Amino acid sequence: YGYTTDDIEFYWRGDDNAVTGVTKIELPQFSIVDYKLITKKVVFSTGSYPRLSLSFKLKRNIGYFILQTYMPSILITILSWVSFWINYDASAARVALGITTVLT
Amino acid sequence: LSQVSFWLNRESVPARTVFGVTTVLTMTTLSISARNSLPKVAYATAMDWFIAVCYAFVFSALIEFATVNYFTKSQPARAAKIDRLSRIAFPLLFGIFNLVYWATYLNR
Ligand SMILES: *[C@@H]1O[C@H](CO)[C@@H](O[C@@H]2O[C@H](CO)[C@@H](O[C@@H]3O[C@H](CO)[C@@H](O)[C@H](O)[C@@H]3O)[C@H](O)[C@H]2NC(C)=O)[C@H](O)[C@H]1NC(C)=O
């Protein structure tokens, strides 16, 4: 915060092994794909300051969403198709199928 | 409730359609709520399997109605036979599934 590059320097101790425990992290909705260590300098009106950056790549797991939103939608669409086999003279049944599926 | 509709008269197309549609939509609502009960795990739970099988049974009941209706006034003995056989093949199969399911999971 207060010390510029004339007062303080930052570096990763190990420079690639400085961060441990990334492979031992279990997220319920995500998977860590990659992590990166960066060493740079930033500039504000008050001077230039050292900065380190630790970044993670997170890929989302889609199983929960297969079970939550996709499969109900596929099933409601197939339910909608069920009406094509009812005879076309039956109006109330086909209207019930169509209206229920559309509004759902 | 979805199997109750096997005892209705097949001339009552709107009624059995109401049965099938309402039961499958109720199963969808129940599945959504139950999957909203617990955290967002990417795998399926035992309750998810029970719900999927119950949904399959309900949808199969609706499909049986569709088949019966497709075979009415074109081959009536066949639709009568299908209704009569379903009236005993659905509840027995669901009882057997419940037995196997609870035996598998309540032993663990
Ligand atoms: C996540 O996002 C960050 C932020 O963009 C990514 O960090 C970026 O990484 C690249 C390559 O590692 C950096 O570019 C490099 O810059 C150096 C500067 O000396 C240059 O010599 C190299 O040739 C290369 O161009 C980039 O600076 C860096 N971004 C920032 C803002 O510093 C990161 O890669 C992303 N992914 C992961 C898994 O972290």
Whole-angstrom distance, CA of residue B3 vs CA of residue B23: 10
Please list, in sequence order, all residues whose beta carbon lies within 8 angstroms of the beta carbon of residue A36, skipping any fewer than 6 positions away: A53, A54, A55
Kindly tell me the burial class for residue A51, based on how many C-beta atoms sit within 10 Å of its own C-beta (0-12, 13-18, 19 or more). exposed
Burial class (CB in 10 A: 0-12, 13-18, 19+), A73: exposed
Q: Are B66 and A85 in contact (CB under 8 A)?
A: yes
| B21–A79 CB contact, under 8 Å | yes
Experimental method: cryo-EM
> Exposure string (b/e) for B78-88, b if CB count within 10 Å is 16 or more?
ebeebbeebee
Distance, CA of B63 to CA of A18 (rounded, Å): 61
> Is the Cβ–Cβ distance between B65 and B20 less than 8 Å?
yes
**Cα atoms in the Cβ-side hemisphere of radius 13 Å centred on A64:** 14
CB-CB under 8 Å, A29 with B40: yes
Structure's resolution in angstroms: 2.5
Instruction: Tell me the nearest-neighbour CA distance from A26 into chain B, angstroms.
Output: 11
Q: Tell me the C-alpha distance between A98 and B35, whole Å.
A: 26
* Residue matched to tokens 């939509």: B25
State in Å, rounded, how far the first CA of chain B is from the last one. Answer: 31
Buried-state track A11-25, b at ≥16 Cβ within 10 A, e below 16? eeeeeeeeeeeeeee
Chain A nearest C-alpha distance from B44 (Å): 8
- Please return the burial class of B19, using the count of CB atoms within 10 Å of its CB with bins 0-12, 13-18 and 19+: buried
Question: Is residue A46 within 6 Å of ligand 1 at its C-beta?
Answer: no
Domain that holds residue B67: 1-108
Tokens 């207060």, residue located: A2
Whole-angstrom distance, CA of residue A48 vs CA of residue A4? 6
| Long-range Cβ contact pairs of A29-33 (< 8 A, separation 24 or more) | A29/A60, A29/A61, A29/A64, A29/B40, A29/B42, A30/A58, A30/A59, A30/A60, A30/A61, A31/A58, A31/A59, A31/A61, A32/A56, A32/A57, A32/A58, A33/A57, A33/A58, A33/A59
A to B CB pairs, distance under 8 Å: 68
Copy the structure tokens of residue A52: 């380190």
| A13 token code pair | 């101790």
Angle at A97 between CA A94 and CA A100, to 5 degrees: 140
Q: Give chain B's domain count.
A: 1
Q: Are B19 and A96 in contact (CB under 8 A)?
A: no
Q: Which residues contact B28 (CB under 8 A, 6 or more apart)?
A: A72, A75, A76, A104, B55
